[model samples]
Target: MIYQPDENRYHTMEYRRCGRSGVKLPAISLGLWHNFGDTTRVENSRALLQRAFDLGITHFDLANNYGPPPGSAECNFGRILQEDFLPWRDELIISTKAGYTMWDGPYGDWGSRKYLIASLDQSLKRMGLEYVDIFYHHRPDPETPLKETMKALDHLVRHGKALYVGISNYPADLARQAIDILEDLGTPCLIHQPKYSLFERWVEDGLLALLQEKGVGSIAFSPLAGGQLTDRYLLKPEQITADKLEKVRRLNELAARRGQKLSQMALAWVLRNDNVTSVLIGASKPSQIEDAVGMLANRRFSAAECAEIDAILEG
Candidate 1:
């Protein structure tokens, strides 16, 4: 049987403009970080992908070395794209990153011009796409000059390998420099991917404000704090500390009072920030995706609720 996407997909999920760019990403974008590797069941991965697309999660995030075996995730996801989404390619936002230890030797990792260009080419080949919607330098390289990496991204846009470029895991100072460099080169920085959640508020210190000031959008990864924000590991003493467990229990209680799950509440908390354009979520099953999308139902928190959450986190 042939796969046909849901016609009413767009009507449900919310879309937000990616900073000043023309691109609008779904509020809940799906990431293929953990589940789409070669060792996983292809049919299970296919089901998750299909369910995500049907629910209006048009943005699919990937990295060059996501799988345990490295590069297997992209290869498997690429096969799925050909089987299911080839016709509706333009409707999707496919993004992949480089800047990790993808291969052996000096050229395999970091933010050098050589590694970035070569990694992207390998990524495109593996994904079976002429160009990805967004190409990112997965992390910053302290040794490589920022100018070289940003320039490589600008080059990719000019050469038609990527529609836009982004940076991930860069600190506030380097992000500002990269934005300025990309701006001067005529390929503006499209977005920033950061690890942000209740447990990680480092971005609040400077990065988020800088992105808003520069008009660069932000999509937060790990918004659930590695399952710490959910009920998944609350009882597993081996997985979480006692202090963290108590805080999560309080948060779960608050969410339950509002008729939302702890996971949904955590996502809603992230979305409350106007500067955050989207939340990148990973799912092993279809139910997780559905629960994530449901976060939009009660996205807003009252002043009192915010204060309570702050107190819980602070305590």
Candidate 2:
């Protein structure tokens, strides 16, 4: 059966503003950090994205180096865009990042001015778009001065290559530095992408509050704690797929205490904070997407619930 975005789909979800920008992205954004890579099937990708649009997920996140095979995910997603989603580009928030390994040599990764500019151009070519809605520096390059990264990001926004600029995996200090540099450049950092889940409280260590103070919005990845937060991992660790074990192992106990599935509880917990703009998510099947979207209706957590959850992780 052909899939078409149900306009009424968004009636069930809330749209959030990205930082202080005038744009409002869906509470849930689709990220291609997994499954949309080389091993993914084209038809499956199409189905996942089709379901996302139908459910009101307008933001699509990507990076220059994403697929296990590298660049394949963007190429694949680009195909779907060309064949089906092209006409709706204005209705979407498409973002691509550069800063991880994409090629064989030193030039393939990092936030160098040279690398960042070239990578976005290559990403545009793969996605078949003249410009992406947002462009991000995937991570910081200790060797490269922060000025270089911020300059490149500002250049992209000023030239119309990207409508917005953001940073992912930046620490609290670096995020503040980015804000200063970008603000000076007249293109403030639009969003901060970080890993925040029941098991991963790195953001709570101060990044979340830092972003809030800077007026930078947050989009969290691995909210399901890789696969550990999901029901599959909580009830049966062995059932945990090799694909998810590496990331979820860090926070399993936190999911067990509440008698709630790791995936469900982790997702609900993040929604507890109003500062969280969007939950970046992924799924192998369309039904999984629906299950995730269903969680938005109820994200509240009580003080007792938080204590029990804390007990599970460190008690």
Candidate 3:
């Protein structure tokens, strides 16, 4: 028998509209960027994904090159889809991207029309998905013309390979170019994915304003600063492990002085922007999801609080 979530699941969490699209996404979307690789236990990912859906998370983010071995993450996730998620595909907003290196040949990676369509097809085969809900152009291709990329995405929608199209890691200017081409192709660019966390303010460099003005929905990834904003890094420097990295020490120290868990504070900061739509987060454990979601209860943070956070990490 298939699993069903508790009746109280919907009441416990919130949903936000993606741009002007009819699709509404859970405020906290799950990404397969980390912890779902070949080295990690596949059951670990299954449990995490199952628990997430039960807790009201309905979006699962992925990329073709998200594994240590490059494509293992998507392959593993595809296995899980066949084994468990296939029955509920319609009720989910599954997405995947291609723009990073996925294989050896030059044609295998980047933003060429040849690569994008082929990549999406392979991604669908791997995930056991007939057609992904939303497909993204993982990153900008310096060499590929914006026209070609937009045409490829338009072809995906026209051919019923994907419902909507999005782009990630795009700066304001390039995003505008993509939007223009997509518009001419008879499909409005659906969304933009950018890295935005308490410590990393790259979006503030103009992407935020651009998204707002263009009526494009924005989903902030790594709003917890890649675990730096979470409780996991509060340990002393000498106790710090290599995985956490040296930069984490500085973030940890700053987060500690304010009597706040870096994760909680960082999550709260992202919520201040009503235009963000949702903050995409990743978690290895179920408890972490609950902890991150708990911050929604007190989403309001004073400007002074923002200033304090900024002052803490001026570097």
Candidate 4:
């Protein structure tokens, strides 16, 4: 069947400014880190993308090492991009990254200029795109000089290989330095993708404020805490510790009081702050995407609600 996007696609979704950039990312973005790989059927992956776009998700995040065989996710997504989404390319924001291990050899991984540059090139080839809307240094390299790594990003933007550049998994101190380097190079870091959730509050330690001050947007990956914050535990348990599950149980009760699902409450909690530009979520099926977007309807918390949620987390 031919794909024609919903004319009302943009009605129900909200878009927020990405830092000081001209871009406005959807409040919820789709991440292809899981299930879009070769392990999953391409048809299901296609459905996820279609459903996401129909629900107003325009940003699709990918990486060279996302697929199980590595690079297969891009290949899979690229095929769908052509078969279904080619006409709407201008409306989409496609981003990819390097810095993880994509192949054997010293240059295959890390933040070195050679690695980041060549990796994006390979990613472009796989995705069949001239350039990604945003290219990220997947993680900070302990050994690579900050200047060298940032210069690679600047080079990409300058050379028109990527429209913007960002960093991920960098701590507060390191993130500040990277943002500074990108600024000095005139690229101006656009966004930072980080691991942030109720279970992981490391960003609250300092990184969140740094990005807020620097005018760099933030997209929280794993905002559902790898599904623990969702009904995954309410229905079935994963190797979660008893103490953690106990807290989830209490939180579930609170969510019930709020008249929402545990997953929706958790997502609403992550978005309660204005600092986060978007939450990057992965879904195995199309309906799960709807489950995430449902949080937008009830995305507020009173002072007491915040205090109570914190007590549950810190308790």
Regions of model 2 farther than 4 Å from truth: 1-3, 234-261
Colliding residue pairs in candidate 4: none
Computed on alpha carbons, the lDDT of every model, listed in order, comes to: 0.93, 0.82, 0.81, 0.92
Q: Where is model 4 more than 4 Å wrong at Cα?
A: 235-238
Model 3 residue runs over 4 Å out of place are 235-260
Give per-model TM-scores: 0.98, 0.91, 0.90, 0.97
Candidate RMSDs in Å, in order, are 1.2, 3.6, 3.2, 1.4
lDDT of 2 at 176: 90
lDDT by residue (tens digit), candidate 1, 1-315: 688999999999999999988999999999889989977898989999999999999999999998867998999999999999999999999999999899999899998889999999999999999999999999989998899999999999999999999999999999999999999999999999999988788899999999999999999999998778887865456688899988999999999999999999999998786889999998988999999999999889899998999999998
* Local lDDT at 150 for model 4: 96
Which is better, 2 or 3, measured by lDDT?
A: 2
For this target, which candidate reaches the highest lDDT against the unseen true structure? 1
Question: Rank by lDDT, descending?
Answer: 1, 4, 2, 3
Clashes of each: 0, 3, 2, 0
Q: Would you give me the overall lDDT of model 3?
A: 0.81
Tens-digit lDDT track for model 3 on 43-162?
788888888887788888999888767778888988887778776777788889989888889888899999998899888887777788889999999888889988999999999999
- Model 4, span 1-315: residue lDDT tens: 999999999999999999988999999999999998889899899999999999999999999999888999999999999899999999999999998899999999998999999999999999999999999999989998999999999999999999999899999999999999899889999999999888888998898889989999999999888878877766234657677788888898999999888888887887787989999998998878998889899889999998998899887
Residue 74's lDDT in candidate 3: 84
